[PDB]
Every structure is written in structure tokens, then in C-alpha cells.
Amino acid sequence: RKFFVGGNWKMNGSKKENDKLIEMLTHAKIDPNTEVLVAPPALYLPSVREKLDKRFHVAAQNCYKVPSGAFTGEVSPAMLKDVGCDWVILGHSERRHILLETDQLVGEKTNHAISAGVNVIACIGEKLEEREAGKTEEVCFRQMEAIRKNLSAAAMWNHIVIAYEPVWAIGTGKTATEQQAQEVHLAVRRWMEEKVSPAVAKSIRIIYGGSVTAANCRTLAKQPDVDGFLVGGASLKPDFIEICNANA
Amino acid sequence: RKFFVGGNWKMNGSKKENDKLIEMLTHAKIDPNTEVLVAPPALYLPSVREKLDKRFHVAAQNCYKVPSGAFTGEVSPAMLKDVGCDWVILGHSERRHILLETDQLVGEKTNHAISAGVNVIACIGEKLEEREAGKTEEVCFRQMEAIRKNLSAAAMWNHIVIAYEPVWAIGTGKTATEQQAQEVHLAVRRWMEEKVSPAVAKSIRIIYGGSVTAANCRTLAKQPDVDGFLVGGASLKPDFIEICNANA
């Protein structure tokens, strides 16, 4: 499986700061076997894509589930393709838990994006009260099942990267270990093996979307079922390059 | 009060179709006393603003309530200003009722946008069961109060245009007359007079956001408390020009 590192800029960006990050990526020495993605705010998607080498993927941080219509404030996969972008992050914990997106909506969006030629980082993960009730797997599997049920063709799994987010470690004073990450990633892969196929399970990338830093990235990357990262705050800093090189 | 016509493109747009609409607007004969605004999808905001003369306002279809942070998929007023856009639509019925935005969230966004130098089209309106139960004023006033309570000073109303959306007439087989529109607009203006000030009530624009067509726009515009329109589907068509000229 090809190592995969995505930088989620979240709601951070400006022409001036974007240019600084683009220059950092342009001059960086990165393992050529690593897939690298950045996700700027939607206003900046066309310009960042124009300015950045195709070696780097440029992803939207959200999209909707039809090509056009009466959905004020939403953008469609067709629009992403129109400005040269073929990736999107869907189901991020901030969109599920702050902006109230349901499991079914995430699955509908994932099917539609892939049908339009946009690859998907599909995010899953459990909250602290769910983890404490022993429902880590029950929650993650329910989120995955909502994606699976909504896909329209078996090949769509070739266009998905799964990101596990330990939401229970965000603003709770709890911290996740690399062993805890590996245990969830392995459980998710075995769900793929049982519910989809062993062939998809062996080839799909499952990336870790908790706190990823220059200090912890190598111990996370060496875990056998952790295939890369969806990076938060460190994607805005020179540390992102060290994280891209965590597998080498 | 200066007549105000906004075109909400909703989730419609592409480089090619945007160029056609921009060429239509650039060469159109429009009443010079009308304020005209267009609101493209967020991906296209920088390009549409660059290509359209400053005579036209260019608005985002949504934004968030702080300048930056961990809000994947959201954009801030500072980003809008960074690409030259100084207007936003907030509280549109599609965002309230499909994407689940609360009264309080709309008020928080409105205050923050104005504090950052972005003017706001603030949308209100009641659904069919609410109107049939006699709650038109109760609902509209509740939505207005959530904005009022969250503003930092009464002077911020000078950066607001109120749009009344008869959501009860959107896709229900019910239709609104110009008399029904005038009745609600008058009730909203009298709320402004009592809860804010007569000076603001007499100067704030209250625009109609129901079905607006080339055929009905002149009869709506002549109502004394209807100050313009927030146009939907007709904003993508040459009919938009006739609607911009409804007051002349």
C-alpha cells in the first residue's frame, strides 16, 4: 500500500500564507513513493491547484451530493473537477459533530463524488462517551456501513482512503497512543475484509487522523495497519515535510 | 431607500457558464439607481469578483463566525475580504432547514461578518405549518431577535439587508401574492421601529425572496415596504436584467 499523507488546512488560509505553504511544498525534498495531498479552504482551491505541481493532490474540505441545485452555500464534485481538483475530504469529525452531518449524508456524498471522478478521504471515529461504553468498533462500523450501503459499484473502493479520527482525544485531555491507533486500524481493515473483500482490505489505505506531529509521526507510521496521516495544525508549518517523510 | 436586487446562483456554476453570466451583466442596460449583487459558489468567488466591475457586489453564499480555526469545510469573513468580496448571504432557508443552521448561529455569523467589514443579506421566513398555525410574526420576530441580540451595536444594522423568504410557498403548491409580501415586510419594518429605532426602520432595505419572475417583479416592486429582491433561478437567465429594472 502506498503511504499517503494529507494536510487538512481547515479554516486557515490567505493569498499570502497560501503562497508561503506552496513555496515550502515546491522546494521540499519528499520521499517519491509517498502520496501527498493538501486541502485548502474552498475560495482558494482554484488558485492553489494552479500554483502547485500535480505531484501534490489538492482536495476540497467538503462537497455536496448532486451536481447542481437549490443548495445555497454548497459546492458539487462537478465544480471541483471544473477547477482541476479531484479529491475531497468527507465526514470529518468537525462536519459530523459541529455541523451535524449524518452517517447517511456522508455515504451519499461519497458515492456521488466518486461517480463524478473525485476521490474521497472518508473520515470515521468515535467520541469519548462512545469509547467509554465499549462502542469504538460499533460506531466505526456503523459509519463504514453507511458508506458501503450507498456505493453504486464495487470499484468505488479503489477511490477511497479511510481516515480514523480519535474524536475522544480532541479537547478531552485524553491522548491516543500509536498502539491504540493500530488496534482500531486493524479492526477497520478486518471489517473491510469481512464486509467487502480480502482483496480490497489488503489494498485500501487507512490513515490516522488524530494528533500528528514531527515528534510522533515515525512511531505511528511504523504500525502495520497505519498507511499515512490526515494532518491538522502541523500541515500549516514546515513540520509537514518531516511528517511526509515519516515512512522513509 | 435604494432599490436592491441580489442574484443567488445557489449551487450552480462553472467557468464557462459564469463567463456567460458575467458578459450578460457587463453589457446589460440596468437602472443606475439599483444596487445589484450576485452570489456565486465559493470556488468561483475570487474569479467572479476579478471579472465583474465594482458597480456589482459579489457575495458569498455562506460564511462562519470566527476568522480562522478548526472548522473543516467552512470559510471566514477575513477570507472573503482577502479575495475582494464584502458581502455574504446568511440564514438562507436552505441553510436553516436542510443544513440545520440555528437562529443563534445565524446571529453569531451576522455579527462577526459585519465586524470584519462584510455586509450581510440576512434571511428570515416561516414554513407552511408555521403559517397555517398563525405563527408568521412569531417565527420572523424570533429569527430577527436572534440577530439583534448578537449584534455589537445598533449601527451594525446599517450593514444589513433583510430578505423575507416565504418558505411556506417554496415547493408546497401554495403561492404568495404581492399583498401577502407587503403585509410581512410591513410587520418586519414595524418590529425594527419598535425594537431598534425608527431611523434604522426607515432606512433598512427589506427585500423579497419568494418566486420572482420577469412577469411579477414590477407588481412586487411597487409595494411600499418591498425594497428589492433576492432572486433564485431567474438570476441565471437574461430575465435577471428585467428584474433588476423592476423599480424603473
Numbering used by the authors:
A (entry chain B), B (entry chain A): 5 to 252
From the primary publication:
Triosephosphate isomerase (TIM, EC 5.3.1.1) is a key enzyme in glycolysis and catalyzes the reversible isomerization between dihydroxyacetone phosphate (DHAP) and glyceraldehyde 3-phosphate (GAP). The overall structure of OvTIM is similar to that of other known TIMs in that it contains 12 α-helices, three 310-helices, and eight parallel β-sheets, forming a classical α/β barrel fold. In OvTIM, a specific SAD motif (S157–D159) is located between α7 and β6, inducing the formation of a subsequent 310-helix γ2 (D159–I164), although the corresponding region is not conserved in either vertebrate TIMs.
